[PDB]
């Protein structure tokens with residue numbers, strides 16, 4: 001592998017798309033590697049980590065309970081609802097909805113939770129309240145994945161998303177238990193977690209949320225480190241590439257390979 005920056009460049013030229021990337025020390029917030037870190041990218045499903053952050057802040061404040069059962073109707077469901085479509089009769093707890101959103105990328109679960117936090121405008125207000133003045137959610141699932149060229153809606157930057165994920169996981173803005181829960185939901189990702197582990201060297205920690213949208217948009221926010229520890233936040237977004245899903249996945253994996261190969265840095 002080339003050095004990470006060189007691999008990222010190669011990825012842009014092979015994908016004919018824009019890559020944005022940041023590697024950040026989880027403990028200190030040190031930015032180690034940055035590429036287009038201040039450019040906008042569609043969040044896609046990665047927004048669901050922030051969403052569950054807002055939910056947990058409500059729980060901490062006594063305005064919400066993870067146990068609270070939410071009942072919903074079929075008319076409420078949107079495209080890709082693998083868990084929520086199974087519980088029309090019996091409902092799902094707020095905590096179950098969070099797990100379905102982060103671990104199983106359930107879109108209707110995400111919308112149900114969005115309802116509880118004041119919708120896209122409420123989640124955006126929450127971002128401002130934790131000092132993220134860049135990330136914005138404007139739409140619900142699934143329109144938020146539209147990824148129109150140049151459209152600022154539903155976007156973040158690698159730098160903002162990394163800083164925000166660090167704030168949610170470690171800054172004591174959330175309670176100890178809530179920080180632990182948000183981390184655990186990312187540890188439990190079923191969409192990409194088990195696949196990533198299958199290709200990581202022994203000893204490497206992974207927790208993640210992945211996202212996918214239109215026009216090539218792909219992304220991952222992750223915690224990664226050797227010695228079974230979450231040492232770094234890695235945020236990678238791709239946009240405006242015509243490439244196959246498989247090659248987008250491979251290119252993201254290649255940037256990861258470069259990070260691992262050149263870790264001691």
Ligand SMILES: OC[C@H]1O[C@H](O[C@H]2[C@H](O)[C@@H](O)[C@H](OCCCCCCC3CCCCC3)O[C@@H]2CO)[C@H](O)[C@@H](O)[C@@H]1O
Nearest residue numbers: 196199200201220222224234236252253256257260261
């Ligand atoms: O010397 C370091 C290591 O080099 C190789 O490991 C390879 C591994 O065999 C390959 O499968 C992976 O591909 C990359 C897999 C990454 C998967 C996605 C990563 C995510 C996580 C963070 C967010 C972005 C993407 O590269 C590493 C590093 O070369 C050797 O196989 C391994 O024995 C050795 O310990």
